Design a protein around this ligand. Structure first.
Ligand SMILES: O=c1ccn([C@@H]2O[C@H](COP(=O)(O)OP(=O)(O)OP(=O)(O)O)[C@@H](O)[C@H]2O)c(=O)[nH]1
Ligand SMILES: [Mg+2]
Ligand SMILES: [Mg+2]
Ligand SMILES: [Zn+2]
Lengths: 8, 158, 53, 1111, 94, 104, 83, 85, 263
DNA sequence: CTCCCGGCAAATTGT
DNA sequence: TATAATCGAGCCGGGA
RNA sequence: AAUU
């Protein structure tokens, strides 16, 4: 739901 | 046509009706401390007594005007519909009457003074609660009404 | 407004909304224009019902 | 003239310093005049201790100092500068490895300074920081609306200094904790604090059904470490539950005195409610390697006991003024300082990584830009930093004492219901119940009561007198709302003989509730009636007779009174009008005893006891924020012996040291030929003749000359194609000469701008070529007088680049300012008001011969319609007139305090003495009763006004005691058929003047995207014909009128051009075309990938772009 | 009130049709320079100048007065639109 | 012809491309020194039309005798500058992207 | 079917009317899918386009009414029967 | 990073000018003049060039920036259209 | 992208939203040509979706896109269309208009019901185009261009132009509006009477329908331009022709206050 | 049920 | 262009 | 934030 968290 | 302070005529009946109302009020406290009526029952009885005393004093103001001063400015303005209404005139010459707390529940204690006599700071302060609630009501309500109107136009415009 | 048969072409829906809406609002800024004294029944207990309907 | 004061109330204490809420707060925040070792930890000092030390190398804080201001106050305003002091801090850098210590004093930027009167100067403009009401930190218990028999405990810290916590007992029986919108069983947190079932079972067990909802076996199976990791995984999904990471997150949420701050007031409220002592402002601690509890167990204990009905446990009223506190200027500013400080700390750690890890001082490590920006942000763009209201001295005094519930850390306007706007019983003596805005902000913005002061914790206290036994002491105790609820407080007017209570039954309060009580029960007594109301409300005489809704308007409108050149104090005052002028600081006073050496228009020089010669310069015709003239006038003469505190100069809107917001005029109350209709006002031309209600106003005009890619703008007297008539009043440089009269269209500052590239059109090349005046390189951009403005030029300020002391924004060669003044005589459309809320616009100005007049020839000034009184119920204005009549003939002014005032008998006595002067003079001069005075007396006795069978003198006196006189109509000469009320009333000219509001536009500027006219008078705007206006045209069925509004008179470009051309040619306006804003709508829907097609009846496309958009 | 406004509402089935007739008629008068008027020299609306009485410049006033006389005929489908315009430009040019 | 109806419908990529006068290839807006618009950027005159009426960018064709000419040197059409309110550009995506209205 | 004024207003056949009321994205996405054509029957539609509303002097009932003087009526009457 | 794009080297100069002024302000205890920055920048730099560089470094502002009061007015609404006749 | 007065630039938020899109699209093209791993190409693709999402409806899904160092969401295409401030309810169902003005209102007892007091200075602006033509018919100015130049400077205005204006407004009506316009009588038509002074004079009888008082109320003025609009105002909208409430049918223009009192 | 998105009077002014 | 560096920091109604 |  959080694009940064997802990429991490 | 003018308005001076003596044009707000305190009826002689006022002092009597208030003294009558105070003896009535004492019987309701006695019927409380003896446990005959509840706090609920006692408060309801107090409001009713004060509602009826208020009506009485209004009628006294208007009878005194009609009989003894039919050309009085307040009376004339109220009767012709030029300005004023019975309840406003009652506050000038009568008693102000019961005021309500912020919750909407009404104070048991009324404002016994009239604007001609002048209020007591505590009476004045008690009154501010109702003024403010009325003022907030008007401000928060016009939006509801305004919104309503736009809905009606949109549904009927064709 | 003319106390006579309506003319064809009169925009009646708009007039209906203004006729219903106008005292709503009007009498909701006149409760100030009152006193502060309590004598129940006000356009702000009524108006929610009107909106409810 | 004599000043007669009424009232029996002896007020034991004077009003506090009225701006102390401002002055004292900021002084406390800065402590600049305190030597650093003695500064207490508060304000700026406390901010530094919170941000430092900065770990990562370790940078520590020693002390700060504030410099002196680079420019004085007058200078800042002139040059558009902020009045501020340089802030420096001594910092020592330590290398924890090496031991190395390098210390330097680094410059952190500037901090804005408060002036003597409690305001600020931010970029040249005067500003006020409004105090903010908000919920006090602490621990509260409120009833749960869903489940009647249950309650919620809330632990609330200072705004932005931590999360809100909720302790709910769920229907399943377990105690839940809510943090950042996430809920869990509170038991988990109890175990992390190191509680074991032994401690918790034995502690709360006393409450039978509740302790079991807390018991969870699985949680006890894990040590405080497993419980800490378990909780972190609940609150932050996806973050790996590293043991050091969880401590870090949870510590920052609870125990960090840097990321979580309860108030100092929060600590006291917590200590007081739960009966504990907090070691600090955090809910817990990190001590001896583990977490040690502080708050949670006492709060949980109180919650269980209340649900059970344990005696001594109450719910908290969240609108009680003990639980609502004020954030004053100092606290608000300090908060922004702390934020700016934390950003600078982020900057420090990032610099402690990059570049040389060895070669660093504090000066290289600290960038103050984050700090300067935070403070500049608060002062420039905050919602609590407001443009000062300095219309008149009272305007600013009231502004500084206002209390806002809005702003950053409080409600929104769409987010506040009734409860907050209501008048709470605890507002008594603390916040004024009358003075609040009418409209959307009602109840959110309020004003501090006159005797109220804000204590160090931020709670409003109000004074009361001790009563021991039956004796009223002179010792006054300032009480909070919480402490006030303990005692029985008698009213201030309760009868007294000496210091003894003289009534057998007194009117008193217990928790605000009115109750009748014996003198033995009186613990305290109100200091005065003035303490219940604001300063504005306290300036309304006979307030006890005015309906509150009108008194509200009375208060607020004094704020808008324009300073008059002839301004006078009201003939009926309340006794506060001296103090307001003195605390306002408009007026000038003598420091010590002394002798006046010199008196000038520009200055007053005083010789004191000291022998020293002190010179006080006077502010003369200075332009305030709102364009009213602040001007001080000398009130003493050369050689006058003055004492300490004696008046030296009058400020604006003050007369001999008394607040003068208006004039005293002779008013008659009676309808007059419909010029009085529905609140309009009729005035005598005699008022203009003697310059009553005349006010000076100054408008500021500004122009910049800047560098362009086309070449410099130049301020010059040389303007293409202009006559010498047009340039006559411009000096050598192109600036209008001081004193010239300027009218709309006139040039103020001449300026040229280089013509753009698409230079003169070839059409223009050839036209000029015909006349043999070859086309110029520059165009006339001069600053001109706007429509409807103009006056006399009183000042010019010119600031160039390259002159000493001045540097402008990049690209700007020079800035010129022109100050234009006007003397405004009262006119039709201007707005007047008295202190009781009677307001009206001037509809007619009669020549003195048409004005109703007294028999002895004196005409009245103002005629106010009586129809305004009865519905409004503001009778104080009526009493004001009667006493004003008495005073007109006796030559005196009065002080009648609110609620302890002049009463009817006393006014009647004064009126009789006046009648003696009004009549006895005539009878001795050899004149008897008039024929027409008899005719009116006949009709008056039919009215029951006079007693039948008394002499005309006796009857006229009967009428005069009712404040009524015989009045002759200046038109006819015949009397008014009845006696009319006449007297002196205090009336103000408010700031709303037709000259400012009149506006009209044929055509003018249009907006970029929509091509509709711009808005507002200053842009030469058109009026908005909005949705509801369209409905009106629709309901009338006016289709062609409406279409005009939608096209030719707005955004139909082709149509409006053609329509204008037709009117100047005498043709009828053409049929309209497509409104450009529909074309905007079409293209905006295409940008959304939606195809919008205008089609004809055959369903074929119609191109409303006329081929321009198709390839 | 506009003179004889009640009588004008009498002449039409719908008030808006009166407005249409008046508006169109006033445009005819303006376009042809009033010389197509059905009024007689003493019926001409007058305007008091500083000089004195002159022709009322306001064409909507003219049309309402003309309408009251009875000399105007209004209705639908009386005549092809183009044909009317040309016949009027022949009798009273511009 | 007279407008009697308004249709609104979804637009194919073909149609979005049928509207467009050019592809906007650069995030550039206007040149920082000359202040004139940057070629292939959001304000380009070669795509959306001339800034000045009947005048191309470089000024080879400056008046209405040329209307419809496209200047060879600067690439700008000679027409009314009003077209900068009308002519659309377009961006050619590397991967298709969903329209949020029809998703959310 | 009985629906309140808001829902009723949003359900009207005219999408220019509905989209200017409220729920603009919802109104516009359903309209765009359906390929809806606004016939410009009501007032809001015509106001948005700057058209002459279909009420008052704009009603088709009174819109086309013609006025002619008796001379011009006769001037035309002989010529049009003539040829 | 900039709505009006700037050549990388010019961006380099601007940041240098920033750093320098921040130094000058930290030692002088007040904002430096253009002349003070031009000296601190070394040869080639006078105050005029310092000013022109800052003018170039100004970023545009949003037409949708709200003006004071209620959020009932945008800045673009106060800007006349100087182009269309 | 427009240069404001001071030479500064002001620009629409859409330009920044497009720029984010273009940057991300271009970078995606580059990453494809250079054969980036799927993790990298995938990140770019999802960022591209978000850029399109903010462009079309910012804030709809996920955190709203902001300009740096501001909390203000950029204004997207959806935000432009919809809401009170949106294109429909701001520039489409209502507009600002030409030939309009405003001032403080004052009672005008002497007026007939169909009249209003209109300040001469207001009328000169509101009727300015009409006034120019009349100034040419009377030799008062050589032509229309010259006449306008004469009105520009206030000291250049002579007394014959005021008589010209009196001729212009003859028989014409203006619209008075007072907000809120709650019902259709919030607008009524009046034949204007030019007055010295800066206030509009309103007839006592219409104060009720307008809910106008004289405590400082202001009204707006409008000029219907065409023969059709002027006809509509005088017939349908004239104050004297609307005497009864369209709601109840009862009299709307009726005695009140002082009038009642005297009678 | 819960949650998620859409609504929440008008015109005007002012720094 | 080369030490090595490797996961962020407001209340309300209505419809799926 | 004002005015109605
Ligand atoms: O927010 C507002 C405030 C005020 N107004 C408008 O101003 C008026 C408030 O001002 P008043 O208090 O005078 O109301 P009123 O005129 O009806 O009172 P009386 O003469 O009967 O004593 C309202 O009646 C309203 O039309 C608004 O429309 N909106
Ligand atoms: Mg009123
Ligand atoms: Mg009013
Ligand atoms: Zn070219």
């Amino acid at each position: 739901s959080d694009p940064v968290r997802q990429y991490l | 046509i003018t308005i001076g302070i003596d044009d707000a005529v305190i009826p002689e009946e006022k002092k009597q009706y208030l003294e009558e109302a105070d003896r009535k009020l004492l019987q309701i406290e006695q019927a409380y401390e003896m446990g005959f009526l509840t706090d609920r029952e006692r408060y309801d009885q107090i409001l009713q007594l004060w509602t009826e005393t208020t009506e009485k004093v209004t009628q006294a103001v208007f009878k005194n005007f009609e009989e003894n001063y039919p050309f009085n400015p307040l009376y004339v303005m109220a009767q012709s519909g030029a300005r004023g209404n019975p309840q406003q005139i009652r506050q000038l010459c009568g008693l102000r009457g019961l005021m309500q707390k912020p919750s909407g529940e009404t104070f048991e204690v009324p404002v016994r003074s009239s604007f001609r006599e002048g209020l007591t700071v505590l009476e004045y302060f008690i009154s501010s609660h109702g003024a403010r609630k009325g003022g907030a009501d008007t401000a928060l309500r016009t939006a509801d009404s305004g919104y309503l109107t736009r809905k009606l136009v949109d549904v009927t415009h064709e | 407004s003319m106390a006579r048969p309506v003319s064809i072409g009169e925009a009646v829906g708009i007039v209906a909304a203004q006729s219903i809406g106008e005292p709503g609002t009007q009498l909701t800024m006149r409760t100030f224009h009152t006193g502060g004294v309590a004598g129940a029944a006000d356009i702000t207990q009524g108006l929610p019902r009107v909106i409810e309907l | 003239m004599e000043i007669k004061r009424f009232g029996r109330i002896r007020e034991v204490i004077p009003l506090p310093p009225l701006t102390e809420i401002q002055v004292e707060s900021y002084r406390r925040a800065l402590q600049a005049d305190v030597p650093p070792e003695k500064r207490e930890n508060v304000g700026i000092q406390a901010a530094f201790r919170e941000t430092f030390p900065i770990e990562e190398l370790v940078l520590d804080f020693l002390e700060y100092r504030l410099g002196e201001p680079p420019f004085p106050q007058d200078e800042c305003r002139e040059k558009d500068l902020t009045y501020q002091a340089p802030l420096y801090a001594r910092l020592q850098l330590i290398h924890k490895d090496t031991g190395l210590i390098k210390e330097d004093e680094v410059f952190l930027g500037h901090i804005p300074l408060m002036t003597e009167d409690g305001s600020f100067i931010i970029n040249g403009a005067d500003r006020v920081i409004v105090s903010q009401i908000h919920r006090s930190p602490g621990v509260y218990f409120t009833p749960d609306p869903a489940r009647p028999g249950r309650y919620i405990a809330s632990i609330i810290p200072l705004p932005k200094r931590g999360p809100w916590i909720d302790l709910e007992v769920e229907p399943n029986g377990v105690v839940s904790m809510k943090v950042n919108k996430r809920k869990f069983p509170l038991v988990l947190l109890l175990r992390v604090l190191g509680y074991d079932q032994e401690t918790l079972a034995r502690e709360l067990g006393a409450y039978g059904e509740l302790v079991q909802g807390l018991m969870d076996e699985s949680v006890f199976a894990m040590r405080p470490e497993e419980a800490l990791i378990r909780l972190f995984t609940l609150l932050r999904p996806g973050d790996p539950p590293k043991r050091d990471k969880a401590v870090a997150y949870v510590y920052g949420l609870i125990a960090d005195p840097r990321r979580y701050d309860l108030g100092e007031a929060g600590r006291y409220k917590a200590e007081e409610k739960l009966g504990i002592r907090l070691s600090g402002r955090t809910l817990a601690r990190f001590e001896d390697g583990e977490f040690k509890d502080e708050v949670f167990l006492p709060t949980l204990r109180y919650l269980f006991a209340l649900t059970a009905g344990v005696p001594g446990h109450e719910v908290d009223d969240i609108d009680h003024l003990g639980n609502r506190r004020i954030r004053t200027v100092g606290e608000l500013m300090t908060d922004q300082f702390r934020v700016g400080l934390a950003r600078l700390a982020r900057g420090v750690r990032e610099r402690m990584l990059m570049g040389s890890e060895d070669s660093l001082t504090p000066a290289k490590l600290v960038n103050s830009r984050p700090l300067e920006a935070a403070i500049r942000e608060f002062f420039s763009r905050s919602q609590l930093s407001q443009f000062k209201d300095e219309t008149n001295p009272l305007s600013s005094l009231r502004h500084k004492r206002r209390i806002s519930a809005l702003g950053p850390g409080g409600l929104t306007r769409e987010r506040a219901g009734f409860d907050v706007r209501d008048v709470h019983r605890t507002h008594y003596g603390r916040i004024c119940p009358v003075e609040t805005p009418e409209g959307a902000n009602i109840g959110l913005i309020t004003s501090l009561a006159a005797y109220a002061r804000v204590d160090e914790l931020g709670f409003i206290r109000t004074p009361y007198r001790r009563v021991v036994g039956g004796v009223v002491t002179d010792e006054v105790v300032y009480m909070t709302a919480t402490e006030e609820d303990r005692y029985t407080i008698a009213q201030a007017n309760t009868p007294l003989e000496g210091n003894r209570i003289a009534a057998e039954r007194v009117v008193a309060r217990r928790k605000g509730e009115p109750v009748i009580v014996s003198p033995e029960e009186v613990e305290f007594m109100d200091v005065s009636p003035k303490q219940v109301f604001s300063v504005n409300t306290n300036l309304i005489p006979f307030l006890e007779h005015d309906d509150a809704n009108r008194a509200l308007m009375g208060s607020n409108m004094q704020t808008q009174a324009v300073p008059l050149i002839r301004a006078q104090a009201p003939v009926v005052m309340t006794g506060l009008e001296e103090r307001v002028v003195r605390d306002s600081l408009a007026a000038l006073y003598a420091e010590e005893d002394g002798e006046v050496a010199k008196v000038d228009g520009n200055r007053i020089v005083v010789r004191y006891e000291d022998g020293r010669l002190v010179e006080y310069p006077l502010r003369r015709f200075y332009r305030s924020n709102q364009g009213t003239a602040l001007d001080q006038r000398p009130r003493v003469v050369v050689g006058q012996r003055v004492r300490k505190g004696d008046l030296l100069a009058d400020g604006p809107a003050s007369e001999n040291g008394f607040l003068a917001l208006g004039q005293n005029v002779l008013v008659a109350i009676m309808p007059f030929d419909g010029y009085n209709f529905e609140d309009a006002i009729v005035i005598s031309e005699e008022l203009l003749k003697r310059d009553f209600y005349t006010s000076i106003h100054i408008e500021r005009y500004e122009i910049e000359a800047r560098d362009t890619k086309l070449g410099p703008e130049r301020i010059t007297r040389d303007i293409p194609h202009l006559s010498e008539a047009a340039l006559r009043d411009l000096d050598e440089e192109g600036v209008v000469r001081i004193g010239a009269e300027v009218k709309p269209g006139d040039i103020l500052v001449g300026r040229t701008s280089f013509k753009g590239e698409s230079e003169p059109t070839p059409e223009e090349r050839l036209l000029r070529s015909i006349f043999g005046e070859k086309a110029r390189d520059v165009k006339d951009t001069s600053l001109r007088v706007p429509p409807g403005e103009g006056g006399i030029v009183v000042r010019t300020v010119r600031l160039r680049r390259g002159d000493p002391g001045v540097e402008l924004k990049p690209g700007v060669r020079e800035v010129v300012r022109v100050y234009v003044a006007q003397k405004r005589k009262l006119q039709v459309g201007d707005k007047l008001a008295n202190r009781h809320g009677n307001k009206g616009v001037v509809a007619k100005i009669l020549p003195v011969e048409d004005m109703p007049h007294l028999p002895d020839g004196t005409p009245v000034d103002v005629i106010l319609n009586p129809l305004g009184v009865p519905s409004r119920m503001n009778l104080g204005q009526i009493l004001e007139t009667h006493l004003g009549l008495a005073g007109y003939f006796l030559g005196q002014r009065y002080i009648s305090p609110i609620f302890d005032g002049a009463k009817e008998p006393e006014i009647k006595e004064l009126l009789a003495q006046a009648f003696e002067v009004y009549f006895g003079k005539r009878k001795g001069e050899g004149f008897g009763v008039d024929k027409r005075e008899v005719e009116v007396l006949r009709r008056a006795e039919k009215l029951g006004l006079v007693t039948p069978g008394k002499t005309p003198e006796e009857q006229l006196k009967e009428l005069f005691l009712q404040g009524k006189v015989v009045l002759y109509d200046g038109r006819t000469g015949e009397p008014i058929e009845g006696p009319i009320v006449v007297g002196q009333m205090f009336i103000m000219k408010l700031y709303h003047m037709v000259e400012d509001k009149m506006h009209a536009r044929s055509t003018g500027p249009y907006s970029l995207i929509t091509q509709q006219p711009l808005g507002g008078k200053a842009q030469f705007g058109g009026q908005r014909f909005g949705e509801m206006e369209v409905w009106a045209l629709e309901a009338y069925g006016a289709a062609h009128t409406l279409q005009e509004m939608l096209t030719l008179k707005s955004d139909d470009i082709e149509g409006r051009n053609a329509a204008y051309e037709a009117i100047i040619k005498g043709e009828d306006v053409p049929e309209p075309s497509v409104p450009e804003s529909f074309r905007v709508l079409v293209k905006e829907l295409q940008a959304l990938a939606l195809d919008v097609q205008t089609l004809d009846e055959k369903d074929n496309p119609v191109d409303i772009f006329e081929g321009l958009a198709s390839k | 009130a506009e003179p004889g406004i009640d009588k004008l509402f009498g002449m039409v089935d719908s008030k808006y049709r009166l407005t249409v007739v008046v508006a169109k008629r006033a445009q005819q008068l303006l376009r042809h320079g009033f010389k197509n008027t059905v009024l007689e020299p003493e019926e001409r609306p007058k305007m008091q100048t500083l000089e004195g009485l002159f022709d009322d410049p306001n064409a909507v006033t003219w049309a309402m007065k003309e309408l009251l006389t009875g000399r105007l005929v209004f209705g639908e489908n009386l005549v092809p639109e183009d044909r009317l315009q040309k016949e009027m430009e022949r009798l009273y040019p511009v | 012809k007279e407008v009697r109806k308004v249709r609104i419908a979804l637009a194919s990529p073909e149609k979005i491309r049928s509207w467009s006068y050019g592809e906007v290839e650069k995030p550039e807006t206007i040149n920082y020194r000359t202040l004139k618009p940057e070629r292939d950027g959001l304000f380009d005159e070669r795509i959306f039309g001339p800034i000045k009426d009947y005048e191309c960018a470089c000024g080879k064709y400056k008046r209405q005798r040329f209307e419809g000419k496209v200047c060879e040197r600067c690439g700008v059409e000679v027409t009314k500058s009003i077209v900068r309110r009308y002519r659309m550009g377009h961006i050619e995506l590397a991967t298709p992207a969903a329209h949020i209205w029809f998703v959310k | 079917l009985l629906m309140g004024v808001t829902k009723s207003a949003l359900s009207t056949k005219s999408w220019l009317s509905a989209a200017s009321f409220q729920n603009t994205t919802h109104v516009l996405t359903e309209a765009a899918i359906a390929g809806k054509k606004d016939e410009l029957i009501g007032l809001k539609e015509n106001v948005i386009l700057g058209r002459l509303i279909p009420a008052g002097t704009g009603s088709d009932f009174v819109r086309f009414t013609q006025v002619v003087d008796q001379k011009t009526l006769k001037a035309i009457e002989e010529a049009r029967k003539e040829a | 990073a900039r709505t009006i794009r700037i050549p990388v080297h010019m961006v380099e100069t601007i940041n240098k000018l920033s750093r320098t002024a921040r130094q000058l302000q930290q030692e002088l205890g007040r904002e430096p003049t253009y002349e003070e920055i031009a000296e601190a920048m070394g040869p080639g730099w006078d105050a005029k060039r310092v000013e022109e560089t800052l003018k170039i470094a100004q970023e545009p502002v949003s037409l949708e920036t709200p003006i004071g009061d209620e959020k009932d007015s945008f800045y673009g609404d106060f800007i006349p259209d100087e182009h269309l006749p | 992208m427009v240069q404001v007065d001071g030479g500064r630039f002001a620009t629409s938020d859409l330009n920044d939203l497009y720029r984010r899109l273009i940057n991300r699209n271009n970078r995606l093209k580059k990453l494809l040509a250079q054969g980036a791993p799927e993790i990298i190409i995938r990140n770019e693709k999802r960022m591209l979706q978000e850029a399109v999402d903010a462009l079309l409806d910012n804030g709809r899904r996920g955190a709203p896109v902001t300009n740096p160092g501001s909390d203000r969401p950029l204004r997207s295409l959806t935000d432009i269309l919809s809401g009170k401030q949106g294109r429909f309810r701001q520039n489409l169902l209502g507009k600002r208009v030409d030939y309009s003005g405003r001032s403080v209102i004052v009672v005008g007892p002497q007026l007939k019901l169909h009249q209003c007091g209109l300040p001469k200075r207001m009328a000169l602006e509101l009727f300015k185009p009409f006034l120019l033509k009349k100034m040419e018919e009377k030799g008062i100015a050589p032509n229309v261009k010259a006449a306008r130049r004469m009105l520009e400077r206030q000291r250049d205005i002579k007394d014959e132009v005021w008589d010209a204006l009196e001729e212009v407004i003859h028989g014409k009506v203006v619209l008075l509006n007072r907000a809120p316009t709650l019902h259709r009588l919030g607008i009524q038509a009046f034949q204007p009477v030019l007055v010295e002074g800066q206030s509009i004079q309103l007839h006592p009888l219409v104060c009720e329908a307008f809910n106008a008082d004289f405590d400082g109320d202001q009204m707006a003025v409008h000029v219907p331009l065409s023969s059709f609009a002027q006809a509509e105002a005088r017939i349908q909208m004239l104050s004297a022709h609307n005497l009864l409430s369209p709601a109840s049918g009862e009299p709307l223009a009726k005695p009140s206050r002082d009038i009642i009192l005297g009678l």
